[PDB]
Amino acid sequence: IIGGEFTTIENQPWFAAIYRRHRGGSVTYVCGGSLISPCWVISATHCFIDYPKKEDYIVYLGRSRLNSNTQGEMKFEVENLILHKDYSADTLAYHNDIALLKIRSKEGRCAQPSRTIQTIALPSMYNDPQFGTSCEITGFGKEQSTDYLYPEQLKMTVVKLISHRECQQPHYYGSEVTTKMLCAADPQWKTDSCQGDSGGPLVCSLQGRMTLTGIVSWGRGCALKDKPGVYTRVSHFLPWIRSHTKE
Amino acid sequence: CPAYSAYIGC
Numbered sequence A: 001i002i003g004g005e006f007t008t009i010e011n012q013p014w015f016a017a018i019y020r021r022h023r024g025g026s027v028t029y030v031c032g033g034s035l036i037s038p039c040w041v042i043s044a045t046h047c048f049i050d051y052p053k054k055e056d057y058i059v060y061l062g063r064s065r066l067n068s069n070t071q072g073e074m075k076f077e078v079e080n081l082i083l084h085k086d087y088s089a090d091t092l093a094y095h096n097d098i099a100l101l102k103i104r105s106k107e108g109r110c111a112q113p114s115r116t117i118q119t120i121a122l123p124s125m126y127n128d129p130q131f132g133t134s135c136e137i138t139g140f141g142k143e144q145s146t147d148y149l150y151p152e153q154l155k156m157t158v159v160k161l162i163s164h165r166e167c168q169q170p171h172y173y174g175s176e177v178t179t180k181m182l183c184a185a186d187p188q189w190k191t192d193s194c195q196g197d198s199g200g201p202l203v204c205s206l207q208g209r210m211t212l213t214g215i216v217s218w219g220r221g222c223a224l225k226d227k228p229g230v231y232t233r234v235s236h237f238l239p240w241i242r243s244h245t246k247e
Numbered sequence B: 001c002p003a004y005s006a007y008i009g010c
């Protein structure tokens, strides 16, 4: 996250931290995600496509720090890793960048809400907030485009939804933005998601509910003028989601 | 890796 503020998991209790275990026994951070029901975390397919084996992944909930333990955190294995069959990576952009992780503890329990863990609501099918609505993004992504290290404490910031019309201007993204994506950015281009925030939530109030509107997908630099963050449009994927969350 | 990836691994 570029700019914004350090936060804790209590202020973003649906946030899931996903890590991968390597052959050496080393474990490194992969992507963010969001807890949409006790047994299900939603993220991006680009995170997993290079190594799509469920066994190699660990999901933490209730975690406020990247490489140290938070009190109240809970560790889960991945019972199913579900990538979208129509995922593709374009020269600039990703398409259908959405993934589901069914989580289970070694004990066999799904998530249990607490001070530090809660689900986030899904939007109604094809229902989004209007352009200019303020939304929240959260993650352990870089604080600067040029950084080599990731922040150890969770960060969040506010961005505003951008119209499809505006996002499609060629000085923005031109043809590469589709209606299955949402753009969002700071009106002065001062704060943004960045490398390592991918898979994480874009959360907007829609009606009276904190709602998962976007999943962090792609963008050129971070906080760079005329280049918004691009997000998977969650409202366009409910059938896909419900087909899997029924088991 | 797309040129505008945000993945740690890109």
Ligand SMILES: N=C(N)N1CCCCC1
Pocket: A192, A193, A194, A195, A196, A197, A198, A216, A217, A218, A219, A220, A221, A222, A223, A227, A228, A229, A230, B004, B005, B006, B007
């Ligand atoms: N919003 C920006 N700038 N991003 C989104 C996440 C990938 C890195 C670039």
